[PDB]
């Protein structure tokens, strides 16, 4: 090796012993070093193994061949120089591990080899090098060589071809080309760009990314760790379940780095090369080559990054459902329902973010400590003042960062309390709205999200001053370095070649603020997520349930407990119910007999006892739970079906006359909450899903509470009865109704949460105690609309919306100090470019410009993100603006999943991801413009180029946009379901538990989130496919350019002119990647305002039409005739109806379940708008008073009781305009005093999510309570006395007629011995008035009144 024939002369020509050693040596030690690491993954990852095809065939006979034509040299060297022993035989070994390497790929399953192929192409490159040197020299050795390298030749050709294998996604199988260009998506990204894309024309997930195999893992891991605990750490089980797969992303990363420094020193070596003209020409031919191979390396990286976070959110999101099904009713209450939805839906957002990070926490400092060397060998040890500056930011940016850690805390706490609070509004709309209480929850949330936007403008007050340390670090750290080193000296080129290192340098430092904030951010999710995974799951095994002694449910001394802290609900329960014995558990309110029935399912934490419950549960929950899935879903609930035992259960149930009134019968959709039926038909359709799944033991929780006497005494006679469906089963009838306990074979009376007293009806009549007394005293059509995806480019109006929510002075400040950052570090560069009195007055301008830069990166940190404050604070205002002014049928219509996914991932994405998004768009905007500047003063005459160059990229991110738009789009359409999910299964866990449906739930929640990663995977597969032409596009102006400077050497700066276009190539391609990141984050603006545009209620308050102060004061509803119709597709339910209901006039609207009657209720407050007539109320019509002028003047208690998650006096007036005393006395006369009084919190007494930690009787008191707090001079009275016992029935009766007794009172009820001291009563049958007049006469006409009468018992 000399340089007089390899670069001195014009033959580029390698020495006789190079070309025998080196060159021999580079392929056959790349297989050496790889064939270890390569069986780790031959092993890990396995796909069977590929039948034998001719191609694996050819490519193994030529491996033979090659072998022996290799060792064939050593036979005829056999036949001086020791190379001539050596490298034959090298050569023939690496060569037979090449050919076991490829029959080792056949046996596990590997269609295209990276390995193979690259090696074969470095083999390829050596031989043509040794090749060229071969015939330039010029039979005994060489043809050996030709032959080699033919074969060589061949065998690469052939390891390009995919093998057979063993809506598919086309990853499964790409060649390797395919996959290391993501050429496997180009197909869908012209597809994309001539119709937008669907849900359809997304690929099947692929079967290493799916739900299914890749949540169970992360739960194994859990699992084991908890087991060695028994805290476990939920970081240990992430790299146990994540590092395998990412691990290989550190190779790749460190690749990148060596090539990214090492392409740099080829453009210098170029530019100074502008030395044989073939010195250029293979300059720029390694620059090409070293730059793509560099692209493609850095972005296979990328995309195991963002494999790896797609995936930690596939296993976060069902291991947060998993622990939600197996979750503890006590932790549930601890972990809110906000809490689980932000864990699920931004929290494994946070691991995304950090996967594209925890490669840069060791590569910053790797590239620092380099530079560090780099500028030593250039100077000396002064720069001992350099990386001390540089070191005393890590200790001083940490504490600031630790700070940051507390923020983040305390945002993602006051965010679940956030969504938790939007939660309660979702579940408890109607009486939100009935109540005209939503600006008083909208002012709620308010103040809940102005707390939590302060907590994040704080955290982006110190990123921003950690990012203003960072950047201007770098210029200490020069500044610093030269100050001790002065005091050899700083010739104008030691002192500068040290410069233009610390600019290289200051890359790492700028990256390092994002890097701290992502592991901030991931720190405070991984604690929120260990947390939750470590919470104490209800154990079933404490219900010894035994399957099919004869005593089904037997109980020994149990003290079943809701918590532990808690004081135990049940006192030592004792009861053996034989087999197949019907089971009354009556009792008052709030004494633990849905305690009992939900601590028979193992709901119940059980302090000391023995239960054992034999058979399957079939439980029916006091609220009905029911699904978005139609009637016949919701009966048989995952069952096959059975026609005649399906037709059975629907008649025996009474739910036949229902389904025909229905649209579509069984088959029409249902709504999210089961909101489109009524109360009893709720019921009725959870008591025959219950009935139809055959089970042995069957808990009923009130299920004809809210049904008539006639259609009560059907079922029960029908379904529970003796002579009933279920007659063979044993029965746990809760009820509060005593018609039906002579049929009961026994009856438990459950006082003060224990058993009082046990019996049959006969026995208990003869014992001569307190039930004794109690008992003589007797007293298709698709409704749910799924989520919409726009088909088009964002509007500019919603641009427009995210900037004048932002405003015009903090727009242009931010704009102003983006053009001045960037105008100030050009002015920096050609300071210090071209201009390199130097010391003291060039060195301090550097330094002085580098900290006038470092402000203003400040300034714009410090503006964007106040800005990303402002217009969070508008977007979301709007939009629960938007959301709660839209009517009750929005809701209806509108699954919860969406109404969730706005507030919660929606709302996210324009808090923290659209404003660092908008200002890298800025800034990589803004360097392309002064890059334009800086190649337009320079050489003019290329300004032709310019506009071209541009054009071509804009075509590019046009043709990328048109498809990445709707992906992220489908993504979003994609996620709503997710939550819809989550919701129905947190609505009802227990109903899952108790019908071990658990497993088919799990299963639709990975359906849902393989639909998710559906559209999300392609996305992040577009960016890598649109990044990959981007940058090739760059390589190719680069090559070009850098081939026009090297064949304009000695023609008319040319060297300037590549280094220009491959700085402008660059800009451009962040530039074309930003924008297109910026388009897809404007797509969660695009959806929050896609609320705006829907049509919402009457305005709440029309001030020309406004009603006297005393209004009311008569309370004459009059309705005309009031057509209701729901939706303007289905038949009238009020059907021209016509009563005069005088001032002060007690009138009960009685009827038959399902007749319209609070569809009444729901025509008063205008909840529903009138299809045909109108209510004229005190000769004022409400069609034309203002919403609240209307609801703020009558009063309602609602058939579902709704308690909102927080204190029971905020539960009693969220408007708290009632005195506490005035509260008391309201909490007095509704027989709740002592309850609330007992309790340890008295009346800041928090009640859980939805009002769980109250039972459904002490619900509707609350709810009798805050209309009694309420009173106006309208009552309407919609069955409150549904699900209490029949002493506080009549307590809350005798107190309804004692306060209101001079307000007119509309009551639906299904008691008729409540209605009978009414005036008039209502009958409705099929919306229409049958019956008009006083129960006495309605008794003497012997009509339908009389009938249901009878069924009561009441004649
Ligand atoms: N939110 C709703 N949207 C659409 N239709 C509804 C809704 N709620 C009930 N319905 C339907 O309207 C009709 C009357 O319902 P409504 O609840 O007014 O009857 P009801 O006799 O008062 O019931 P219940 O006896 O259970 O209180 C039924 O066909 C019912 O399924
Ligand atoms: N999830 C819960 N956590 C804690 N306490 C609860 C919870 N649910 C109910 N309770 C309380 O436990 C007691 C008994 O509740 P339970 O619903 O079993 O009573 P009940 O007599 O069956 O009610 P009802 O008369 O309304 O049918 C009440 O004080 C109730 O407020
Ligand atoms: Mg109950
Ligand atoms: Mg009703």
Request: aromatic share 10%; net charge neutral.
């Given at each position: 090796?000399?340089?007089?024939?390899?670069?001195?002369?014009?033959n580029?020509?390698?020495?006789?012993?190079?070309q025998?050693?080196?060159?021999?040596?580079?392929?056959?030690?790349?297989?050496?070093?790889?064939?270890?690491?390569?069986?780790?993954?031959?092993?890990?990852?396995?796909?069977?193994?590929?039948?034998?095809?001719?191609?694996?065939?050819?490519?193994?006979?030529?491996?033979?061949?090659?072998?022996?034509?290799?060792?064939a040299?050593?036979?005829?060297?056999?036949?001086?120089?020791?190379?001539?022993?050596?490298?034959?035989?090298?050569?023939?070994?690496?060569?037979?591990?090449?050919?076991?390497?490829?029959?080792?790929?056949?046996?596990?399953?590997?269609?295209?080899?990276?390995?193979?192929?690259?090696?074969?192409?470095?083999?390829?490159?050596?031989?043509?090098?040794?090749?060229?040197?071969?015939?330039?020299?010029?039979?005994?050795?060489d043809?050996?060589?030709?032959?080699?390298?033919?074969?060589?030749?061949?065998?690469?050709?052939?390891?390009?071809?995919?093998?057979?294998?063993?809506?598919?996604?086309?990853?499964?199988?790409?060649?390797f080309?395919?996959?290391?260009?993501?050429?496997?998506?180009?197909?869908?990204?012209?597809?994309?760009?001539?119709?937008?894309?669907?849900?359809?024309?997304?690929?099947?997930?692929?079967?290493?990314?799916?739900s299914?195999?890749?949540?169970?893992?992360?739960?194994?891991?859990?699992?084991?760790?908890?087991?060695?605990?028994?805290?476990?750490?939920?970081?240990?089980?992430?790299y146990?379940?994540?590092?395998?797969?990412?691990?290989?992303?550190?190779?790749?990363k460190?690749?990148?780095?060596?090539?990214?420094?090492?392409?740099?020193?080829?453009?210098k070596?170029?530019?100074?090369?502008?030395?044989?003209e073939?010195?250029?020409?293979?300059?720029?031919?390694?620059?090409?080559?070293?730059?793509?191979?560099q692209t493609?390396?850095?972005?296979?990286?990328?995309?195991?990054?963002?494999?790896?976070?797609?995936?930690?959110k596939?296993?976060?999101?069902?291991?947060?459902?998993?622990?939600?099904?197996?979750?503890?009713?006590?932790?549930?209450?601890?972990?809110?329902?906000?809490?689980?939805?932000?864990?699920?839906?931004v929290?494994?957002?946070?691991?995304?973010d950090?996967?594209?990070?925890?490669?840069?926490?060791?590569?910053?400092?790797?590239?620092?400590?380099?530079?560090?060397?780099?500028?030593?060998?250039?100077?000396?040890?002064?720069?001992?003042?350099?990386?001390?500056?540089?070191?005393?930011?890590?200790?001083?940016?940490?504490?600031?960062?630790?700070?940051?850690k507390?923020?983040?805390?305390?945002?993602?706490?006051?965010?679940?309390?956030?969504?938790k609070?939007?939660?309660?509004?979702?579940?408890?709309?109607?009486?939100?709205?009935?109540?005209?209480?939503e600006?008083?929850?909208?002012?709620?949330?308010?103040?809940?999200?102005?707390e939590?936007?302060?907590?994040?403008?704080?955290?982006?007050?110190?990123?921003?001053?950690?990012?203003?340390?960072?950047?201007?670090?770098?210029?200490?750290?020069a500044?610093?370095?030269?100050?001790?080193?002065?005091?050899?000296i700083?010739?104008?080129?030691?002192?500068?070649?040290?410069?233009?290192?610390?600019?290289?340098?200051?890359?790492?430092?700028?990256?390092?603020?994002?890097?701290?904030?992502?592991?901030?951010?991931?720190?405070?999710?991984?604690?929120r997520?260990?947390?939750?995974?470590?919470?104490?799951?209800l154990?079933?095994?404490?219900?010894?349930?035994?399957?099919?002694?004869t005593?089904?449910?037997?109980?020994?001394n149990?003290?079943?407990?809701?918590?532990?802290?808690?004081?135990?609900?049940?006192?030592?329960?004792?009861?053996?119910?034989?087999?197949?014995?019907?089971?009354?558990?009556?009792?008052?309110?709030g004494?633990?007999?849905?305690?009992?029935?939900?601590?028979?399912?193992?709901e119940?934490?059980?302090?000391?006892?023995?239960?054992?419950?034999?058979?399957?549960?079939?439980?029916?929950?006091?609220?009905?739970?029911?699904?978005?899935?139609?009637?016949?879903?919701?009966?048989?609930?995952?069952?096959?079906?059975?026609?005649?035992?399906?037709?059975?259960?629907?008649?025996?149930?009474?739910?036949?006359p229902?389904?025909?009134?229905?649209p579509?019968?069984?088959?029409?959709?249902?709504?999210?909450?089961?909101?489109?039926?009524?109360?009893?038909?709720?019921?009725?359709?959870?008591?025959?899903?219950?009935?139809?799944c055959?089970?042995?033991?069957?808990?009923?929780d009130?299920?004809?509470?809210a049904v008539?006497?006639?259609?009560?005494?059907?079922?029960?006679?029908?379904?529970?009865?003796?002579?009933?469906?279920?007659?063979?089963?044993?029965?746990?009838?809760?009820?509060?109704?005593?018609?039906?306990?002579?049929?009961?074979?026994?009856?438990?009376?459950?006082?003060?949460?224990?058993?009082?007293?046990?019996?049959?009806?006969?026995?208990?009549?003869?014992?001569d105690?307190?039930?004794?007394?109690?008992?003589?005293?007797?007293?298709?059509?698709?409704?749910?609309?799924?989520?919409?995806?726009?088909?088009?480019?964002?509007?500019?109006?919603?641009?427009?919306?995210?900037?004048?929510?932002?405003?015009?002075?903090?727009?242009?400040?931010?704009?102003?100090?983006?053009?001045?950052?960037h105008?100030?570090?050009?002015?920096?560069?050609?300071?210090?470019?071209?201009?390199?009195?130097?010391?003291?007055?060039?060195?301090?301008?550097?330094?002085?410009?580098?900290?006038?830069?470092?402000?203003?990166?400040?300034?714009?940190?410090?503006?964007?993100?106040?800005?990303?404050?402002?217009?969070?604070?508008?977007?979301?205002?709007?939009?629960?603006?938007?959301?709660?002014?839209?009517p009750i049928?929005?809701?209806?219509?509108?699954?919860?999943?969406?109404?969730?996914?706005?507030?919660?991932?929606?709302?996210?994405?324009?808090?923290?991801?659209?404003?660092?998004?908008?200002?890298?768009?800025?800034?990589?905007?803004?360097?392309v413009?002064?890059?334009?500047?800086?190649?337009?003063?320079?050489?003019?005459?290329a300004?032709?180029?310019?506009?071209?160059?541009?054009?071509?990229y804009?075509?590019?991110?046009?043709?990328?946009?048109?498809?990445?738009?709707?992906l992220?789009?489908?993504?979003?359409?994609?996620?709503?379901?997710?939550?819809?999910?989550?919701?129905?299964?947190?609505?009802?866990?227990?109903?899952?538990?108790?019908?071990?449906?658990?497993?088919?739930?799990?299963?639709?929640?990975?359906?849902?989130?393989?639909?998710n990663?559906?559209?999300?995977?392609?996305?992040?597969?577009?960016?890598?496919?649109?990044?990959?032409?981007?940058?090739?596009?760059?390589?190719?102006?680069?090559?070009?350019?850098?081939?026009?400077?090297?064949?304009?050497?000695?023609?008319?700066?040319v060297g300037?002119?590549?280094?220009?276009?491959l700085?402008?190539?660059?800009?451009l391609?962040?530039?074309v990647?930003?924008?297109?990141?910026?388009?897809?984050?404007?797509?969660?603006?695009?959806?929050?305002?896609?609320?705006?545009?829907?049509?919402?209620?009457?305005?709440?308050?029309?001030?020309?039409?406004?009603?006297?102060?005393?209004?009311?004061?008569?309370?004459?509803?009059?309705?005309?005739?009031?057509?209701?119709?729901?939706?303007?597709?289905?038949?009238?339910?009020?059907?021209?109806?016509?009563?005069?209901?005088?001032?002060?006039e007690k009138?009960?609207?009685?009827?038959?379940?399902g007749?319209?009657?609070?569809?009444?209720?729901?025509?008063?407050?205008?909840?529903?708008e009138?299809?045909?007539?109108?209510?004229?109320?005190?000769?004022?019509?409400?069609?034309?008073?203002?919403?609240?002028?209307?609801?703020?003047?009558?009063?309602?208690?609602?058939?579902?009781?709704?308690?909102?998650?927080?204190?029971?006096?905020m539960?009693?007036?969220?408007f708290?305009?009632?005195?506490?005393?005035?509260?008391?006395?309201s909490?007095?006369?509704?027989?709740?005093?002592?309850?609330?009084?007992?309790?340890?919190?008295?009346?800041?007494?928090?009640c859980?999510?939805?009002?769980?930690?109250?039972?459904?009787?002490q619900?509707?008191?609350?709810?009798?309570?805050?209309?009694?707090?309420?009173?106006?001079?309208?009552?309407?009275?919609?069955?409150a006395?549904?699900?209490?016992?029949?002493?506080?029935?009549?307590?809350?009766?005798?107190?309804?007629?004692?306060?209101?007794?001079?307000?007119?009172?509309?009551?639906?009820?299904?008691?008729?011995?409540?209605?009978?001291?009414?005036?008039?009563?209502?009958?409705?049958?099929?919306?229409?008035?049958?019956?008009?007049?006083?129960?006495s006469?309605?008794?003497?006409?012997?009509?339908?009144?009389?009938?249901m009468?009878?069924?009561?018992?009441?004649?």
């Amino acid at each position: 090796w000399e340089w007089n024939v390899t670069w001195n002369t014009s033959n580029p020509d390698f020495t006789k012993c190079f070309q025998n050693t080196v060159l021999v040596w580079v392929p056959c030690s790349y297989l050496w070093v790889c064939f270890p690491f390569y069986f780790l993954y031959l092993s890990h990852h396995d796909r069977g193994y590929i039948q034998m095809t001719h191609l694996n065939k050819a490519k193994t006979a030529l491996g033979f061949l090659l072998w022996i034509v290799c060792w064939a040299d050593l036979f005829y060297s056999f036949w001086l120089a020791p190379v001539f022993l050596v490298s034959p035989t090298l050569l023939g070994i690496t060569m037979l591990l090449a050919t076991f390497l490829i029959q080792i790929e056949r046996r596990r399953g590997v269609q295209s080899s990276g390995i193979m192929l690259t090696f074969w192409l470095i083999a390829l490159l050596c031989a043509l090098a040794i090749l060229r040197s071969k015939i330039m020299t010029a039979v005994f050795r060489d043809v050996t060589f030709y032959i080699y390298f033919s074969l060589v030749l061949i065998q690469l050709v052939l390891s390009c071809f995919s093998d057979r294998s063993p809506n598919p996604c086309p990853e499964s199988s790409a060649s390797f080309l395919s996959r290391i260009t993501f050429w496997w998506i180009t197909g869908m990204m012209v597809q994309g760009y001539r119709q937008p894309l669907e849900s359809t024309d997304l690929w099947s997930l692929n079967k290493e990314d799916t739900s299914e195999q890749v949540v169970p893992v992360l739960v194994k891991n859990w699992k084991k760790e908890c087991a060695k605990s028994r805290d476990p750490s939920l970081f240990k089980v992430l790299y146990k379940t994540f590092g395998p797969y990412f691990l290989m992303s550190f190779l790749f990363k460190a690749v990148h780095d060596l090539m990214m420094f090492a392409g740099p020193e080829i453009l210098k070596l170029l530019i100074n090369f502008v030395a044989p003209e073939w010195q250029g020409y293979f300059y720029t031919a390694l620059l090409f080559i070293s730059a793509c191979l560099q692209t493609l390396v850095l972005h296979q990286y990328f995309h195991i990054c963002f494999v790896s976070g797609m995936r930690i959110k596939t296993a976060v999101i069902g291991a947060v459902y998993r622990k939600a099904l197996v979750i503890t009713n006590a932790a549930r209450k601890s972990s809110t329902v906000g809490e689980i939805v932000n864990l699920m839906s931004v929290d494994a957002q946070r691991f995304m973010d950090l996967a594209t990070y925890i490669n840069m926490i060791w590569s910053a400092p790797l590239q620092v400590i380099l530079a560090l060397y780099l500028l030593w060998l250039n100077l000396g040890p002064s720069v001992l003042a350099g990386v001390a500056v540089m070191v005393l930011m890590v200790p001083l940016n940490a504490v600031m960062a630790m700070k940051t850690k507390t923020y983040q805390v305390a945002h993602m706490k006051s965010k679940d309390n956030r969504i938790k609070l939007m939660n309660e509004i979702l579940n408890g709309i109607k009486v939100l709205k009935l109540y005209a209480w939503e600006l008083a929850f909208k002012d709620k949330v308010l103040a809940i999200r102005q707390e939590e936007l302060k907590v994040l403008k704080k955290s982006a007050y110190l990123a921003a001053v950690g990012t203003f340390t960072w950047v201007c670090t770098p210029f200490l750290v020069a500044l610093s370095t030269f100050a001790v080193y002065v005091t050899n000296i700083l010739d104008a080129q030691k002192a500068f070649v040290s410069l233009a290192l610390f600019n290289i340098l200051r890359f790492p430092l700028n990256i390092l603020p994002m890097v701290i904030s992502s592991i901030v951010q991931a720190s405070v999710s991984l604690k929120r997520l260990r947390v939750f995974l470590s919470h104490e799951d209800l154990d079933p095994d404490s219900i010894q349930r035994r399957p099919i002694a004869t005593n089904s449910i037997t109980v020994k001394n149990a003290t079943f407990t809701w918590a532990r802290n808690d004081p135990p609900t049940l006192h030592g329960i004792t009861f053996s119910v034989p087999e197949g014995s019907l089971v009354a558990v009556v009792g008052q309110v709030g004494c633990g007999k849905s305690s009992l029935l939900s601590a028979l399912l193992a709901e119940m934490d059980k302090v000391e006892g023995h239960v054992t419950v034999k058979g399957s549960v079939a439980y029916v929950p006091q609220q009905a739970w029911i699904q978005n899935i139609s009637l016949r879903e919701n009966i048989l609930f995952g069952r096959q079906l059975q026609e005649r035992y399906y037709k059975a259960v629907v008649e025996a149930c009474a739910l036949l006359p229902d389904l025909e009134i229905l649209p579509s019968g069984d088959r029409t959709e249902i709504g999210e909450k089961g909101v489109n039926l009524s109360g009893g038909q709720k019921q009725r359709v959870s008591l025959a899903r219950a009935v139809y799944c055959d089970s042995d033991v069957y808990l009923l929780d009130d299920p004809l509470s809210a049904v008539d006497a006639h259609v009560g005494k059907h079922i029960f006679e029908n379904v529970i009865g003796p002579k009933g469906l279920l007659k063979n089963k044993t029965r746990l009838l809760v009820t509060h109704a005593i018609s039906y306990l002579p049929q009961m074979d026994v009856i438990i009376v459950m006082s003060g949460g224990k058993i009082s007293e046990m019996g049959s009806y006969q026995e208990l009549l003869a014992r001569d105690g307190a039930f004794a007394e109690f008992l003589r005293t007797y007293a298709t059509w698709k409704l749910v609309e799924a989520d919409k995806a726009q088909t088009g480019q964002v509007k500019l109006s919603v641009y427009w919306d995210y900037m004048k929510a932002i405003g015009l002075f903090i727009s242009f400040l931010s704009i102003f100090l983006f053009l001045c950052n960037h105008v100030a570090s050009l002015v920096s560069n050609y300071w210090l470019s071209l201009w390199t009195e130097h010391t003291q007055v060039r060195l301090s301008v550097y330094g002085a410009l580098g900290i006038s830069q470092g402000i203003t990166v400040f300034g714009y940190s410090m503006a964007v993100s106040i800005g990303g404050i402002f217009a969070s604070r508008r977007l979301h205002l709007d939009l629960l603006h938007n959301v709660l002014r839209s009517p009750i049928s929005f809701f209806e219509r509108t699954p919860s999943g969406n109404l969730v996914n706005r507030f919660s991932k929606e709302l996210d994405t324009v808090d923290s991801m659209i404003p660092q998004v908008i200002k890298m768009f800025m800034g990589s905007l803004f360097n392309v413009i002064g890059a334009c500047i800086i190649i337009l003063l320079a050489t003019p005459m290329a300004a032709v180029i310019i506009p071209p160059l541009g054009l071509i990229y804009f075509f590019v991110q046009r043709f990328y946009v048109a498809s990445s738009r709707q992906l992220k789009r489908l993504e979003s359409v994609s996620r709503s379901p997710v939550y819809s999910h989550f919701n129905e299964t947190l609505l009802g866990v227990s109903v899952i538990r108790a019908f071990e449906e658990q497993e088919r739930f799990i299963r639709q929640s990975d359906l849902k989130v393989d639909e998710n990663q559906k559209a999300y995977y392609p996305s992040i597969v577009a960016n890598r496919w649109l990044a990959v032409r981007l940058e090739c596009v760059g390589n190719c102006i680069v090559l070009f350019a850098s081939l026009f400077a090297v064949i304009s050497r000695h023609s008319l700066l040319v060297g300037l002119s590549v280094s220009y276009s491959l700085q402008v190539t660059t800009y451009l391609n962040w530039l074309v990647r930003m924008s297109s990141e910026m388009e897809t984050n404007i797509v969660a603006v695009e959806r929050l305002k896609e609320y705006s545009e829907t049509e919402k209620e009457a305005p709440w308050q029309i001030q020309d039409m406004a009603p006297p102060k005393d209004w009311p004061q008569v309370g004459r509803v009059e309705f005309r005739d009031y057509g209701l119709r729901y939706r303007e597709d289905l038949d009238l339910v009020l059907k021209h109806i016509n009563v005069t209901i005088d001032g002060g006039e007690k009138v009960g609207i009685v009827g038959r379940t399902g007749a319209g009657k609070s569809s009444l209720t729901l025509g008063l407050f205008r909840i529903k708008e009138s299809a045909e007539g109108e209510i004229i109320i005190d000769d004022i019509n409400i069609a034309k008073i203002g919403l609240h002028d209307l609801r703020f003047k009558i009063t309602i208690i609602p058939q579902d009781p709704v308690l909102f998650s927080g204190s029971l006096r905020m539960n009693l007036d969220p408007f708290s305009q009632y005195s506490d005393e005035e509260v008391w006395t309201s909490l007095e006369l509704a027989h709740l005093k002592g309850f609330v009084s007992a309790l340890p919190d008295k009346l800041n007494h928090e009640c859980a999510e939805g009002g769980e930690n109250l039972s459904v009787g002490q619900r509707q008191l609350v709810c009798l309570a805050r209309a009694l707090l309420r009173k106006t001079k309208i009552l309407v009275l919609d069955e409150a006395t549904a699900a209490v016992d029949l002493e506080t029935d009549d307590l809350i009766q005798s107190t309804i007629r004692t306060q209101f007794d001079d307000c007119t009172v509309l009551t639906i009820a299904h008691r008729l011995n409540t209605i009978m001291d009414y005036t008039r009563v209502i009958v409705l049958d099929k919306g229409e008035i049958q019956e008009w007049g006083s129960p006495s006469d309605l008794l003497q006409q012997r009509g339908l009144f009389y009938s249901m009468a009878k069924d009561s018992g009441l004649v």
